[PDB]
Every structure is written in structure tokens, then in C-alpha cells.
Unconditional design. Structure first.
Ligand SMILES: Nc1ncnc2c1ncn2[C@@H]1O[C@H](COP(=O)(O)O)[C@@H](O)[C@H]1OP(=O)(O)O
Ligand code: NA
Ligand code: NA
Ligand code: NA
Ligand code: NA
Ligand code: NA
Ligand code: NA
Lengths: 217, 484, 194, 145, 97, 194, 96, 49
């Protein structure tokens, strides 16, 4: 929770992790800019769920331990939104967040929990413009893996067969187009039905809450 | 109290035989409470009350006014939560809300087990957990829905639901505050439950499951003894008598005067509220804690026999008298017209004048000099350079409530004049002036902008005011007004 | 159509998975719809709709600013008397006096003291009336400062009156009761019975 | 609303406003909402209408007055309109982004006529009365056409 | 800003279903909200990301570039920096130039 | 915004019983009728045409810039109705521009630069403004209000316990101010002393 | 219903109350409707109501006592409503 | 930033609107240097301001 809070408060004030000391409070770091205090408190509520009584006056070391007591280790809505934006706006065409996790698993052997940390560190060193090449994107994630190695203290081809399945996939697509086949109609109808199931299930669940299992049976 | 006489309000004692007969002593205690209350007032300061069924026009609302006047802290439920209802309860608190009083209005459906549990959880939860942090002293569960024209064979969904509100979820509500008190080891602050009971159980018929609801509540007189909740709840049954509604023409009010000719008492809502608030006096609060109390507040109506046939006769005779007079009236009117002609009754029909709007600029009124010279000091005359006194000579606005004229009517009075309504109708383009033939006939005045049908100023309010208010002032953003 | 089929086979694409899942879901819809229909047959539409939740802690409006409303009540009384909306006979002025007394604190007395003392009786009979009512109300509020507030209904008690004109129109008014002019007398009436 | 209440309250306290004589607050934005630049022009229009009518409109959305404001003893927060027997002066107060503080005082116009002679006043009354009849003529013609 | 290459965008109507592309659930839902019928979004079961197929009839914005003919301006001397006058980095990033 | 000001200025002259602005020039020099009205953001629809519509190569009047300026509402008023060659001092005062306007107007007359002055404030509501006031958390969050069971009528509730941000609106307000000595001479109504 | 005091009254008790009161009213109503439908004014069905002398005397009976007491309205509804020729009411106060 | 950068969902300070106003240059001057509680009358005069 200390890495997650440090990165969120650092990224908001647009400063590196070293610039924001964890001994200082949100009210302190913000100066008099209460506009920015309200955003950080809204972002911490979005992220972790609940908050201490006066989070602005709690030092960030201490805020981290309160969140740690109720924190699963999962990234939560605010972190996930900012990492999606980092990738979609600063990575080169086709370099998805999933391509960037495949690269952190392949090149540095990191599982889902540690990649979460590498991307959080990447968010607080967010490049100013989009990176030009796939080479520059890997160079960036290499540099961000070594910064994560410091902060947590840790030491650091069937592409021809994939190339054909892509061709086959596209030939299928153009044939479907010609035949006026709507390959996705089935899934579309399913998603709609799945929703009307949840809708009815809720109505039936409500009646069970009101009347009780004994009565309804 | 003449011995041999039973008062129109009394308390009852349970005989070993098991009937509830009048008790002169307890009734004295209660009636003396009322006399004291009437001369010196009763305080309810430090009393925490939950009341359901206190809508505008109800007995409950008259009880609520009293609780607040005495400095009680009260939770009112409404099943019709709305700005109209919210503003209603605000105006009650702003008028009657004494020092130390607070009023808390919550939306609540007594038909819902979940609402019952959630409401009591809210009342008892700490302020830190977003509750009131209260512990109730009185519960007044008056919530109910009317069932009329529903005999035995008609009893269905509405009646089964009504019965849930008016019995099964009152038991549930009592049970919840029992659980909350016991959970916190509260053995010495019982909540007094003012049960709204009926003296007539399927006497009149067609009340769906009303009578079954109201009779069932009478078990609580015995359950207080037989179960483990006596220290948490006390039971105070009010047998509520004939209670003339908002004092307007009801099918029940029109026979009230008739019922009273029998030597029997019907009640205003204020009277019945006073009767009920008389059960929260310290004396009868303490009496409830000893043993369950039962208050006959039924104006000796018990004593008129065949109460249904009698009631029904009174209504028949009134309606008969009305119907025959209305018929004989209409026929003697027509017999006059046939004999005397439609001439005779054109020299009868008066000429009524309907108002047209006459919108004014409202320049300030200039008083006569003698009167205006008294306002300012005598010395001011010829003291100011009037080239250096700055004066507002005219003003105007375009805003959510139209012009400065229309906005001021809405700000100050909360509703439009004819002149306000016609100006709004004109601004918003509902109506346009017309001067020339309208379908071959000549016409001067307002016309609906769409239909080009003529419109009288008198009809502008009925035709357009609802739309004027719907599409003026603070409201949902309309995309057509901001470029989509 | 056949070239598509052999390409789908190669790609291990299951062109019909979507429709398969849909048919399965459509069945579990009909299954739930039947359970919900049965409950509506047993309980009825009125009950099933009726039993819906309304309570919500965030909708709880809370009124406690009596300290403000007292000064408003006072000023509203004051101007109603000046304008002759309320006269020295009206009981509304006695009950509105009770409600002001029921909110007596040091600020309220200072408020009435200012407004009543600074009213100029020479401006007319209504100004004199409000000045006298005011002085009496200040005296009351001083005595009842530090006294529990009180429920006191001072209204005219009424009884039913039903009337039918010559043309069979039915009127219902609430009329003053003969010998019952206040609640002290109402309690007496109730004690004597009939 | 707290800052404003506090600054009005302290203006009155410093100039020795009488204990028990609070200013009566009108909060016109309950009805109109906040039109930024125009905010104070609407409030001025209202102040003028209050002075001339002697009617102080109520903040009809004042369901419950913030306990924190009880401390400001020189301010009254009415929820309903009072028809007074007169209002002599109104304070209009505005606060904008970028430290834009503002106060205007508007005094009842009948205080002007104290300054001039009966002859001059009577001439004015005649002239206004004529202009007003002509303005009504103009307005109704301009409205319907 | 390069007055010789003004960046603008032109609305065009997609003539042919586009190639699917990956995006967050949050972003995919945003695309769906705008385009309705004219985009399909589908959860990718493994990643939890979504595929976004923009369909024929959808509207795109394609960047294009205008040559402008005001190439000259009276500009504060190149190198001018509020920092050299003593103004903090925090003020510079808060405030309009 | 300019339409709201034109209508407001017209209605304000009528409220002053001045049917034809040129009547002022019977009493006063062409140099001594002024306009000290202003705006917070001015013609924000023109700003969108400049910054957004142009970017999309949507067709937009070539003079759109002129229509955005805070000082061109007052320009159109002079160019369509007044024809004064008097003062023109246009305040930007955010939420306080109307009171700033009165202040400038008063001082402009007391300096002798003007005997009559148009005065007041105006601002529109549009998508971009609404969003930014939201990003600053200055405006009430309508979804929060709904959670609390508030209708739009009751979402602007000043000095209340539960007050929760301002409700944005649109429009204009104009006053005509002059030397009392002139108001008396002209026989125009006098609604108040500034 | 046993061991169910006031605060325990829930699904079972609300259901029990439906069996033992509301659906007895319904049952009576149905045979009323069927007789009237066929103009049967002179063959009343005698309803032997099972009533209780003890109403919340013992406690912990859930809504037993409310069920059994409610039935006592039928003594008056026979007079007040239009079903007297179709049903007669015969309350049995059943002992130990 | 308000009208174009926001439209492109480019990241832009949440208080960007405050920084656009003609009267906030004078605000920053007062809030960083002057600390006056004196007049603040901000003209829009196009080329003549
Ligand atoms: N479902 C319900 N839940 C709670 N209170 C109810 C319900 N239905 C009706 N009420 C209340 O019962 C009261 C009965 O009053 P009366 O004595 O005139 O019959 C109503 O004014 C109403 O208050 P409300 O309308 O605010 O819900
Ligand atoms: Na009229
Ligand atoms: Na307005
Ligand atoms: Na409210
Ligand atoms: Na209100
Ligand atoms: Na807004
Ligand atoms: Na700036």
C-alpha cells in the first residue's frame, strides 16, 4: 500500500518518488492548493475504498499502514485507469498493456504481482511524449524493472506459425464479409440474455430477502 | 366523575376472568394527566420517538406537532418522500420545533421487512457509522393503507399487504428495537409502544383485513408477560374513536353530528392527538412499565347498539333528503321554464367578467411631499451635491425565471399572477398575439403558437402553467438549449 | 461458405460457440421468469410491487435549527400584527406566543428587546398593540428561560355540523362547540360522559 | 456561505450594530442558481425590488440552517417571505475566483426627495407620471408585436 | 505550433469494418457509449482487456494539415525563462504563461 | 450572451421609461453616456468555435474571434441602440463582475466622464465551463444529490447543513445609473440610491 | 411454531400465519363465490373455526396467537357482509 | 487546455479554468507579492486595455 500511495500522490503533484518524502502529509505537500488536496483524497477513496478520519493531516508512511490492514494487494480502480492511459497514450502502436506484461514475464521473469509494481514505478516516470519504437518501449520497461528492483530490494520461436494463423484469420474475415455473415451475432445475443438473467435473478433475490427462504419455498 | 358513569375517555384493568373493564382509579390518573396537560402543558424533552403514519391531514401529524412543541427528538417516516413532503415537515419544525427538539424525516415502506430492519439499525447505529446514535423511548406505528369495498371473498394482494404493514411488520419493528436494546444491555429504558387499536372488529364489513390486523395487536397485552421483552418495550393500546378527518365533507363526517345526537362523542384530529399525547405523560409512561395500559378513547360509541345498521340509517336518510330535494329542484326549474319560456330565465342569468392580464412596469410610488419629507432629516434639504448622488433609474435581467418581473413574483410569492403567467407564456413562445380574422371571424388576443387556437388570459394558467414551471428555473439540462 | 468452414477448422475457431451460450442463457431466463411469475401468481402484483425498499440513510433530512426559526416566528408575528392580519382576539397570537416561549434563550430575548423597544407606538393602534404584546412576551420568555418547553393546544375545540339547503346541497362545517371553548373544558366534558 | 456570514457578521460587530438587531439574509441563488458574472446584477435587481416593495423574500430551500452559523449573531436566515412596513437599505456582497470581493449598499429612494424643495419634487412627480404612461404604451405594443 | 503545418482533424464515415484493437474495459465501454450499434466490444477472457471492432457507419477523425500564411510574430527573446527571474517550477506549471 | 445583454439593456431602458435611447442626448453630451457592464468568461460559444469547431474543420464565421471578447457585448449595445461616444470600461470580475461594474460605473460618473452609465454583468452556461467547474468540485454533483433524495428545485440551498456546491446558471442583469440631479431633471423613475 | 418470541418472528411465522388465517379467509371466500355464482342462497357451509382460549399466554408461539385471535372477526363479519347465506361460523375453543 | 486538450482526453490540470480568466494574473500578483485588500478592477479593452 506504501508503493501504491507514494506513486498516486507523486504522479498527481507531477514529481518523481524521491521529490515526495513519505514523512510529510498531503496538506503539507499540496502547499495551500486545496483544489489538489480534494483530488488526492478523492483518488485515495476511489483506490482503497475507505479512509482514516483526517487523511490530509496523516503522514503518508502512517496512511500506508492503515490502508495495508484492509488491502488485498490488488491494484483497484484508480491505479488501473492511470496504467491503461499510460500504455494507450505513451506506448507505440500495438504495444498493449498485455504485450508489456508478456515482456516483463519473458525478459525479467516477473509474475502478475511484481509486474503491477514495475508498471506503478513506470507511471511515476511516465514519458512526456509517446515512445517511438518497440525498441524504446522495451528500453523504458528495462529501466523501470531496475528502479523496482531498488525500491523492493530484488536481484535481476513459433512466430512463423503465429504469422500464418494471422493470414488464415484475415482470409476468413474477408469471406465472412462477402457472405454478409455476422460472425459475432451469437455472442451479442448471449451478452444481452446474460444481462436479462442478472436482472431477473436480482428481482428473485429481492423477494427472497423480503419473504425469506421458508415462505418462498 | 359521577359514580355510576363511565367517562368518554378512560383506562381499563384486566379482570381475572380476562376481560378489560373500566377502572375508575387508573382513569382518574389519566384524566387528571389531561387536565394538568391542558392548563400547564406537558414537556417531552429528552424523549426519543419513532412515528410512522404521520402524513399531512392525519392524527399522526397532530401528534408530531405536539411532540415537537414539547421538545421531543422524533423520527418521522414518509412512504411519499418528495420535495412537497420534505418542505411540509420543514415548515412544521420551523413553527412548532421547541428548544431541544429535532425532527428527522426518512423515506420508509413499513411493508418491507428490509426497511423495518434498516430504519431501526440507522436509529441505533453510532454517528461514526452514519446512524443517529439514539435509543427509542416511544414507538407510534400508525402507518396503514385504506381497504374499502373488500369483503371476505375480495380479500387478495392489497389486503394481505395491508395486513403486513399494520400487524406482521409492527411485530417485526418491535422485535428489532428489542434486539438492539438487549444487544447493548439496555434493561432500564423501555420504549412505550402506542398501539393504534379499534373498538369495532368486522362490525362494518368491507374493510379487507383491517379488523384482523387491529384485533391481532391485542395479543401484545399478554406477550408482554409471557416473553422476554418486558424491560425493552411496554405496550400502551389506544382504542381510537370516531375521528372526523381534515374537517371537510367526508361520507363519515356528514353523519358525525347524527351519531352525537345519541349522547356519544366524535373527535377532531387535535382532540384525538391530545388524547394520545396524554399517554406519554410521566404518570401513564410509568403505568405502562408496571403492566400493559389500555386506553378507551372511543367517545362512549361502544354503548350505541347495532352500530352498523344505525350508522347506515343516518347516511340513507341524509342522501335520500339530498337526492329528492335535488330532483324536485331540477323538475320545478324545468316546469317553470316550460310555462314561462327561455325569455324568463335570460332576464335571470347574470353577466360575469373574466380577468385579462394587465402587465405593469411597477415604477416606484411617489408619496406626497409632506409625507416623504418626514423620512429624511430636516437638515438634508440642500445639503447634497445631487450630481454626486448616484441613483438606479432602471433595471432588467434575462435568467432562469424570465424577466425581473417574473423572477420577482417567483422569488417573493412562489407563484405567478395572471400577469406573471401570461408573460412567461409569451417569453417561452406558448402564446403569440393575433389581430385579424381567425377562421372567417375577427379575433384580437392570445393564440396557441402551435395550433393557432385562440386562448383567453383566464385559461393561460390551466393550459400552460405546469409546462412553464417544468421548463423554467433550475432543472435537468435540455440539450436543445446548449447546441446538443 | 466452404472455404470459410475449412479456415475456421484450421484456426480451431468455434463459429457456433456464441449461439450455443445464448440458447443456454435464454433457457435460464425462461426458468427464472417462471419462478418470478409463480411468486406473482401467489402474492399478487400489489404485494410484490408494494414490498419494495424506500429507506436509505442518505435521504434522511434532519431539522434542528430552532435557534434560527424562533427569531423568524417572532418577526412574522410582529409584522402580521402591524398589518392587521392578526388582531388582539385571534388565538393564533396565543399559540404563536407559546412556540416563541418554547424556544426562549438569551439571544431571542435580546432580539425581542431590540425590536419591541425600537417600535414607535405613535405610528398607529397596531404599533401600540404589538409593542404591548411584545413587552408581555419578553416578560414571559424571561420567566420560561431555563424551563422545559411544553405541548399546549390553545385552539378552539369544534364539533360536526351537517346541513342540506332547499336544493338538496349537502354542507359539512366544523363549528364551535356550545359549552366547550378550550381543552380544560374538553377534559371536563369527557369526565362527565353522557 | 460561512466566509460571507462571518465577514457580514464582523462588519456589523465592528460598527456597533445593536445586539438583537441581526441583518436579514436573502439568498436569491436558491431560486436562480449562480450565473457567474451576472450573479450580483440579479441580486441588485432584487435589492431594488425589496426596497420599493418592503418585502424580504425567504430562502425557501433553507431546510435546516448550518449549526456553525449560530455563532454569527448579527445574521438571521429566514426560510419564508416577510412583508415588512419598510426596508431602508440593502447590502449586496459578491465573492469571485481570484480574490474578487465586492459590496454595494443600496438606500431606499424616498431618502433622495428629502434633499429637494416641494416645488421641485412636484414637478418631477408630474414628469415621471407622464413618462410612465408612455412607457406602458411602448411596452405592450413592443410585447404583442 | 508550426504555422506552416496547422494540425486539424476531418470527420470521415468508416466505409468498411476496421481491424479490432485492444483497450481497457473502461475505454472500450466509452467507445461503446459513443458509437452504439457501430462498435462491438468483447472481453478477452485471459487478459481481462477488451477488443474494440469499429464497424462500417462509425465516424472517425483523421488528422490533416493546413499551410497558414502568418509565419511571423513579435516574440519574447528566445531563451526567456521565468526561472531566470526567480519564479519557482511549481508556479510555472500552475499558471498560464 | 450578446442576445441576453441586448434584451436586458432594452428592458432596463423601458424600466427607466426611456423608450428611445437618443432621448438621453436632449439632456447630455454624446460623450457622457457610458457602459461599465462586464462578464466573467464572455462569449464562450465563440471560444468553442475558435478552439474546437475550427480544429474539426467545421465551418465557423471568419469574425468568430470578435464575438468571444468580453467587451463586444457592450460594443453591439452601442452599435445597435445607444450610439454614445462616452466611457467604455469593461470589468472581468468572475462571480463578482456585477458589483465591480457598479463600482466602476459610480466612479465614472463621480469623475465627470459620464452622467448616465449602463452597468451590470452577464455569462452563459456551456459544456466546457460546466465540466471545469466540476473538475474543481465547485458545482453540486447531481448524482450525489440524487443519492440524498434531492430534486433539482432543492439542489441550490444556501446556508444549509447539507449544502454541497453551487448550481450553475446563465443570463444577464443590467441597471441604468445616473446623477440624481439628472434623474430628477429627466423625470425618470428612481428605484434606489447607490 | 415453537421457541419463536416477538424478536424471532420471521419467514416461518409469516408463512404459518398465512396457512392458519389469511388462506382460511381465502378458502371461505372461494366457497362463498362458488355458491353465489350458482345462486345457492339456502345451503350454507358450516365453518368449524379452530380457536384458542390462550392468546400469547405461553409465548414463543411465533404468530400462532395472532392467527387464532384474528379468526374471531368472523363472528361479526357474518352479520356485516353479504356471505351469511353461504357460510355459517361455528368457533370451537379447543382445550388441552 | 479547456476546449481542445480536454476534448482529446489529453491530461490537463483540474483547475485549468481558473488560469484562463483575465482577472487571475492580478490574483497571482496579489497572492505571491502584494497581499493588498485594496481595489481589484480588471478591464477588458482589446487593443486599448
Ligand atoms: N407503506 C407505508 N409505509 C409507511 N407509512 C405508510 C404506508 N402507507 C401509508 N402510510 C402512512 O399511513 C398514514 C395513514 O394516515 P391516516 O390516519 O390518515 O390513515 C399516511 O398518512 C401515511 O403516511 P405517508 O403518507 O407520509 O406515508
Ligand atoms: Na387584470
Ligand atoms: Na433571473
Ligand atoms: Na429537506
Ligand atoms: Na424548506
Ligand atoms: Na455545472
Ligand atoms: Na494564470
Amino acid at each position: 500500500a506504501s508503493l501504491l500511495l507514494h506513486v498516486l500522490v507523486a504522479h498527481k503533484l507531477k514529481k518523481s518518488l524521491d521529490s515526495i518524502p513519505m514523512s510529510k502529509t498531503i496538506k503539507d505537500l499540496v502547499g495551500g492548493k486545496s483544489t489538489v488536496q480534494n483530488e488526492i483524497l478523492g483518488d485515495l477513496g476511489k483506490e482503497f475504498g475507505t479512509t482514516p478520519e483526517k487523511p490530509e493531516e496523516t503522514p503518508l508512511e502512517e496512511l500506508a499502514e492503515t490502508f495495508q490492514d484492509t488491502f488485498s494487494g490488488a491494484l483497484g480502480k484508480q491505479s488501473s485507469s492511470l496504467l491503461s492511459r499510460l500504455i494507450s497514450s505513451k506506448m507505440p502502436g500495438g504495444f498493449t498493456i498485455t504485450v508489456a506484461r508478456k515482456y516483463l514475464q519473458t525478459r525479467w521473469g516477473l509474475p502478475s504481482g511484481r509486474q503491477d509494481g514495475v508498471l506503478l514505478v513506470a507511471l511515476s516516470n511516465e514519458p512526456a511524449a509517446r515512445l517511438g519504437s518497440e525498441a524504446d518501449a522495451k528500453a523504458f520497461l528495462d529501466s523501470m524493472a531496475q528502479k523496482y528492483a531498488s525500491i523492493v530490494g530484488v536481484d535481476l520461436l513459433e512466430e512463423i506459425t503465429k504469422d500464418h494463423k494471422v493470414l488464415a484469420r484475415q482470409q476468413l474475415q474477408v469471406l465472412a464479409r462477402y457472405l454478409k455473415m455476422d460472425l459475432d451475432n451469437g455472442e451479442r445475443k448471449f451478452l444481452k440474455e446474460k444481462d436479462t438473467v442478472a436482472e431477473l435473478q436480482a428481482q428473485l433475490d429481492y423477494l427472497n430477502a423480503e419473504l425469506g427462504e421458508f415462505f418462498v419455498n | 366523575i359521577p359514580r355510576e358513569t363511565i367517562p368518554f375517555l378512560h383506562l381499563r384493568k384486566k379482570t381475572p376472568a380476562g376481560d378489560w373493564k373500566y377502572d375508575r382509579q387508573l382513569s382518574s390518573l389519566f384524566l387528571d394527566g389531561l387536565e394538568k396537560a391542558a392548563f400547564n402543558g406537558v414537556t417531552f424533552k429528552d424523549k426519543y420517538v419513532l412515528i410512522t403514519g404521520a402524513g399531512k391531514g392525519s392524527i399522526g401529524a397532530e401528534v408530531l406537532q405536539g411532540l415537537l412543541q414539547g421538545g421531543a427528538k422524533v423520527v418521522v417516516t414518509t412512504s411519499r418522500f418528495s420535495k412537497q413532503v420534505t418542505d411540509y415537515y420543514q415548515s412544521i419544525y420551523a413553527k412548532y420545533g421547541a428548544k431541544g427538539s429535532t425532527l428527522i424525516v426518512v423515506p420508509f415502506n413499513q411493508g418491507s421487512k428490509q426497511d423495518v430492519e434498516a430504519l431501526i439499525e440507522f436509529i441505533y447505529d453510532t454517528e461514526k457509522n452514519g446512524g443517529l446514535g439514539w435509543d427509542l423511548d416511544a414507538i407510534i406505528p400508525f402507518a396503514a393503507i385504506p381497504e374499502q369495498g373488500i369483503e371476505l371473498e375480495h380479500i387478495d394482494s392489497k389486503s394481505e399487504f395491508a395486513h403486513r404493514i399494520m400487524l406482521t411488520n409492527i411485530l417485526r419493528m418491535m422485535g428489532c428495537v428489542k434486539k438492539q436494546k438487549s444487544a447493548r444491555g439496555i434493561e432500564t429504558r423501555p420504549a412505550q409502544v402506542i398501539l393504534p387499536m379499534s373498538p369495532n372488529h368486522g362490525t362494518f364489513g368491507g374493510d379487507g383485513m383491517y379488523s384482523e390486523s387491529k384485533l391481532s395487536l391485542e395479543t401484545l397485552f399478554n406477550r408482554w408477560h409471557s416473553e422476554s421483552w418486558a424491560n425493552q418495550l411496554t405496550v400502551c393500546g389506544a382504542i381510537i374513536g370516531w375521528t372526523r378527518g381534515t374537517g371537510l365533507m367526508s361520507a363519515n363526517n356528514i353523519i358525525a353530528e347524527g351519531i352525537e345526537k345519541m349522547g356519544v362523542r366524535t373527535f377532531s384530529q387535535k382532540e384525538m392527538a391530545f388524547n394520545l399525547l396524554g399517554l406519554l405523560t410521566p404518570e401513564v409512561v410509568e403505568l405502562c412499565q408496571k403492566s400493559p395500559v389500555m386506553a378507551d378513547l372511543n367517545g362512549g360509541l361502544q354503548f350505541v347498539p347495532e352500530l352498523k345498521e344505525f350508522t347506515a340509517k343516518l347516511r340513507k336518510e341524509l342522501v335520500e333528503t339530498s337526492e329528492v330535494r335535488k330532483a324536485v329542484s331540477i323538475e320545478t326549474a324545468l316546469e317553470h321554464k316550460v310555462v314561462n319560456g327561455n325569455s324568463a330565465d335570460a332576464a335571470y342569468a347574470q353577466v360575469e367578467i373574466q380577468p385579462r392580464a394587465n402587465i405593469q412596469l411597477d415604477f416606484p410610488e411617489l408619496k406626497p411631499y409632506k409625507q416623504v419629507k418626514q423620512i429624511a432629516p430636516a437638515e438634508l434639504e440642500g445639503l447634497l451635491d445631487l450630481e454626486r448622488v448616484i441613483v438606479v433609474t432602471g433595471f432588467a435581467e434575462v435568467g432562469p425565471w424570465g424577466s425581473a418581473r417574473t423572477r420577482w413574483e417567483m422569488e417573493a410569492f412562489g407563484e405567478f399572477s395572471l400577469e406573471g403567467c401570461v408573460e412567461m407564456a409569451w417569453i417561452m413562445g406558448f402564446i403569440s398575439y393575433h389581430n385579424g380574422n381567425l377562421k372567417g371571424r375577427p379575433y384580437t388576443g392570445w393564440v396557441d403558437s402551435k395550433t393557432k387556437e385562440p386562448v383567453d388570459d383566464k385559461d393561460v394558467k390551466a393550459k400552460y402553467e405546469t409546462s412553464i414551471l417544468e421548463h423554467s428555473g433550475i432543472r435537468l439540462i435540455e440539450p436543445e438549449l446548449f447546441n446538443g | 461458405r466452404q472455404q470459410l468452414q475449412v479456415l475456421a477448422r484450421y484456426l480451431k475457431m468455434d463459429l457456433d460457440n456464441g449461439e450455443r451460450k445464448f440458447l443456454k442463457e435464454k433457457d435460464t431466463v425462461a426458468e427464472l421468469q417462471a419462478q418470478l411469475d409463480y411468486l406473482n401468481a401467489e402474492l399478487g402484483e400489489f404485494f410484490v410491487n408494494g414490498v419494495a425498499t424506500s429507506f436509505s440513510r442518505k435521504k434522511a433530512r434532519t431539522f434542528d435549527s430552532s435557534w434560527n426559526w424562533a427569531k423568524q416566528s417572532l418577526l412574522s408575528l410582529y409584522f402580521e400584527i402591524i398589518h392587521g392580519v392578526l388582531k388582539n382576539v385571534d388565538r393564533e397570537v396565543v399559540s404563536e406566543a407559546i412556540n416563541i416561549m418554547n424556544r426562549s434563550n438569551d439571544a431571542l430575548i435580546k432580539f425581542m428587546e431590540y425590536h419591541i423597544s425600537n417600535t414607535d407606538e405613535t405610528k398607529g393602534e397596531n404599533y401600540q398593540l404589538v409593542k404591548t404584546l411584545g413587552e408581555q412576551l419578553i416578560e414571559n420568555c424571561k420567566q420560561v428561560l431555563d424551563v422545559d418547553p411544553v405541548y399546549k393546544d390553545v385552539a378552539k375545540p369544534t364539533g360536526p355540523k351537517t346541513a342540506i339547503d332547499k336544493n338538496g346541497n349537502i354542507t359539512y362545517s366544523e363549528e364551535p362547540r356550545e359549552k366547550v371553548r378550550k381543552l380544560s373544558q374538553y377534559v371536563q366534558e369527557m369526565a362527565l360522559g353522557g | 456561505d460561512k466566509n460571507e456570514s462571518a465577514t457580514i457578521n464582523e462588519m456589523m460587530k465592528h460598527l456597533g450594530r445593536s445586539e438583537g438587531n441581526p441583518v436579514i439574509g436573502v439568498f436569491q441563488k436558491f431560486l436562480t442558481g449562480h450565473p457567474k458574472g451576472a450573479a450580483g446584477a440579479w441580486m441588485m435587481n432584487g435589492a431594488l425590488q425589496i426596497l420599493n416593495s418592503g418585502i424580504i423574500p425567504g430562502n425557501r430551500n433553507a431546510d435546516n440552517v448550518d449549526k456553525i452559523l449560530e455563532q454569527f449573531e448579527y445574521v438571521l436566515y429566514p426560510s419564508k417571505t416577510l412583508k415588512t412596513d419598510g426596508v431602508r437599505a440593502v447590502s449586496i456582497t459578491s465573492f469571485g475566483f481570484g480574490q474578487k470581493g465586492g459590496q454595494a449598499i443600496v438606500v431606499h429612494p424616498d431618502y433622495l426627495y428629502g434633499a429637494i424643495t416641494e416645488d421641485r419634487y412636484n414637478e418631477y412627480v408630474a414628469k415621471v407620471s407622464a413618462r410612465e404612461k408612455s412607457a406602458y404604451k411602448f411596452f405592450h405594443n413592443g410585447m404583442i408585436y | 505550433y508550426n504555422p506552416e503545418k496547422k494540425e486539424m482533424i476531418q470527420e470521415v464515415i468508416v466505409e468498411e469494418d476496421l481491424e479490432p484493437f485492444e483497450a481497457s474495459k473502461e475505454t472500450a465501454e466509452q467507445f461503446k457509449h459513443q458509437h452504439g450499434d457501430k462498435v462491438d466490444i468483447f472481453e478477452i477472457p485471459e487478459t481481462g482487456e477488451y477488443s474494440v471492432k469499429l464497424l462500417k457507419g462509425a465516424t472517425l477523425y483523421i488528422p490533416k494539415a493546413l499551410r497558414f500564411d502568418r509565419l511571423v510574430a513579435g516574440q519574447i527573446p528566445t531563451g526567456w525563462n521565468a526561472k531566470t527571474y526567480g519564479i519557482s517550477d511549481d508556479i510555472i506549471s500552475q499558471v498560464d504563461p | 450572451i450578446t442576445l441576453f445583454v441586448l434584451v436586458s439593456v432594452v428592458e432596463a431602458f423601458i424600466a427607466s421609461g426611456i423608450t428611445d435611447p437618443y432621448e438621453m442626448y436632449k439632456y447630455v453630451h454624446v460623450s457622457e453616456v457610458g457602459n461599465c457592464s462586464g462578464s466573467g468568461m464572455g462569449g464562450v460559444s465563440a471560444l468553442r468555435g475558435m478552439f474546437k469547431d475550427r480544429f474539426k474543420d467545421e465551418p465557423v464565421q471568419n469574425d468568430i474571434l470578435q464575438e468571444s471578447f468580453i467587451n463586444t457585448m457592450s460594443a453591439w449595445v452601442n452599435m445597435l441602440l445607444i450610439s454614445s461616444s462616452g466611457p467604455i470600461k469593461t470589468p472581468v470580475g468572475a462571480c463578482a463582475t456585477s458589483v465591480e461594474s457598479v463600482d466602476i460605473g459610480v466612479e465614472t460618473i463621480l469623475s465627470g466622464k459620464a452622467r448616465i452609465c449602463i452597468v451590470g454583468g452577464y455569462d452563459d452556461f456551456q459544456e466546457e465551463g460546466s465540466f471545469e467547474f466540476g473538475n474543481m468540485k465547485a458545482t453540486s454533483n447531481t448524482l450525489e444529490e440524487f443519492e440524498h433524495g434531492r430534486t433539482p428545485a432543492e439542489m441550490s440551498r444556501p446556508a444549509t447543513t447539507t449544502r454541497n456546491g453551487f448550481m450553475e446558471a446563465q443570463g444577464a442583469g443590467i441597471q441604468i445609473i445616473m446623477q440624481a440631479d439628472l434623474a430628477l431633471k429627466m423625470g425618470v423613475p428612481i428605484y434606489g440610491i447607490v
